[model samples]
Target: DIQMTQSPSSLSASVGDRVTITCRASQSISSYLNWYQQKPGKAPKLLIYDADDLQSGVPSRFSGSGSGTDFTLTISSLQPEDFATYYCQQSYSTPNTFGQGTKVEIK
Candidate 1:
């Protein structure tokens, strides 16, 4: 498993701004990366997996990009409903391991 060893534990952002969070693994993960967003009581949805495969039902503003041991989760334009903690998880090959939660609280 490409355990995400380096990343921003959390952050603060404002609406209409472009916000990006970085995830890095100690080992080469290639395109093995996943992004998710959670809103407290609701289950977080996958922004994408397998690198660029955008998760179904995710909004157009949600963009995902990654390569080597680095994966990125970017919100093209922050929206009113976007907030709380975000997460990065591994795949089925290596028991889904989770990175430290990155919280993006509204500004």
Candidate 2:
């Protein structure tokens, strides 16, 4: 299983601000990275699949990029409801691994 780590574990930003979180894998995993958003008291929701594919019904502001060992999840314009924890997971191996998560807070 590959380990995943996210930078800045937490961040403070206002609505309309651009937010980005970086995810790095323990080893190269190609384009198998997936992104999810989890609000408090709710199950995580998939935002991006297989690197840069946006999940259905997800807002256009949310986007993803990168491959191999590094990936990024970006929010074009943060919304009030965007305050949540974001995670990156790799699906290239037998046991998928997730990052520690990056928390987005109101600022």
Candidate 3:
């Protein structure tokens, strides 16, 4: 019953650009979200979690901030290898929910 349709459908960005992708939930999730980055034929890696907590070992340029039903994943600087698909998943309690995807195409 929770699809990320209320969030940004997709995004486009060029190298060195700072990009911000936002995601939302139908109800108040109360900071129970995780962010992932995926590339072609590769598994998604956790970039952030629990709403706005950045994952360990991840680059300093990647950050997240949000609470409740509104959250955001931000890239301080879009690097050359940053072009990929990003997804937002909620752990508030569900049967697995993820956004369609936010693709940062290299331009």
Candidate 4:
């Protein structure tokens, strides 16, 4: 199984601040990376796919970039309602895996 892991389990950011998180795959998975954001008590929402494409309905401030075994999820300007847990996943193989998550909180 491909495992994904993130750093800084949690992050503190104020409204309008930019927040970034890194995601890595246990092994190379090309550019089949995807990112998601999950608010407390809500299902995860897709943010990016195929490395850098933003999924529909996501805000313009949310963007992604990278390939192969490494990737990044960036929120250009954090909003008050953006506090949540962010995760990365790879769709290139079966038994897909997700990064533990990085929680976003108000500073």
Candidate 5:
């Protein structure tokens, strides 16, 4: 299994502001990266995958871009309901690993 690590364990952003989080992998996983957003007491929803492709049903403001062993998750325009925890994971191997997570807080 590949190990994933994320930066800025927490962040503060106001509505309409942009927020970015970084994720790094122990080794190259090509374009198998995936991003997810989670709200309190709810399951995470896929936001981005294969590096920059937005998953179906996700809002357009949520985006991702990166390759190889690094990735970035970006929220183009933060909304009140977008304040939550975000994580990055790899689908390139079994027993996938997830980044510790970055929590987005309302500012």
Candidate 6:
């Protein structure tokens, strides 16, 4: 199984600020990385897939990139509703593995 690690386990940012979170896999996973936003007591909302493809219905400000062992999720302009935890998952193999998680707080 591949281990996923995320940087900046938690962060504080204000509305309109650009936020960037990183995820790294213990080994190559190609472009199977996916990003999700999870609010308290709610299901995670998929925001990006296959490394950099934006999910339908999500804002353009949200983006993802990178492949192999490293990936990034970017929020061009943070919104109030965007304050939550972000996670990265790799679907390249059986038993998908998820990142530790990155919490975004309101500043």
lDDT tens readout by residue for model 2, 35-96? 99999999988899989999889899999999899899999999999999999989999799
Best by TM-score: 6
TM-score (all chains, Cα) for each model: 0.87, 0.97, 0.91, 0.95, 0.95, 0.98
Q: How many clashes (backbone N, Cα, C below 3 Å) per candidate?
A: 0, 1, 0, 0, 0, 0
For candidate 1, write residues 13-79 as lDDT tens digits: 8889888888877777777788878888989777889866787788888887887777888889988
List runs of model 3 lying over 4 Å from the truth: none
Off by over 4 Å in 1: none
Cα-based lDDT at residue 16, candidate 3: 89
Candidate 3 residue 39 Cα shift, in angstroms, is 0.2
Candidate 6 lDDT tens digits, 1-107? 99999998999999999999999999999999999999999999899999999988989999999989999999999989999999999999989989999999998
The digit string of per-residue lDDT tens for model 3 on 51-96 reads 7788788898988888887888889998888888899998877676
Worst 10 residues of 2 by lDDT: 89-98
Clashing pairs in 5: none
lDDT at position 103, candidate 5? 97
Tens-digit lDDT string for candidate 4 (1-107): 89998977999999999988999898898889999889888999888999899988888999998888889998999889889999999999998788999999888
TM-score order of candidates, top first: 6, 2, 5, 4, 3, 1
Give candidate 1's TM-score: 0.87
Better of 2 and 6 by TM-score: 6
Pick the winner on TM-score between candidates 5 and 6. Answer: 6
RMSD to truth, every model: 1.7, 0.7, 1.4, 0.9, 0.9, 0.6
Q: Residue-wise lDDT of candidate 5 within 1-107, one digit each (tens)?
A: 79999999999999999999999999999989999889989998888989899988889898888889999998999989899999999998998888999999988
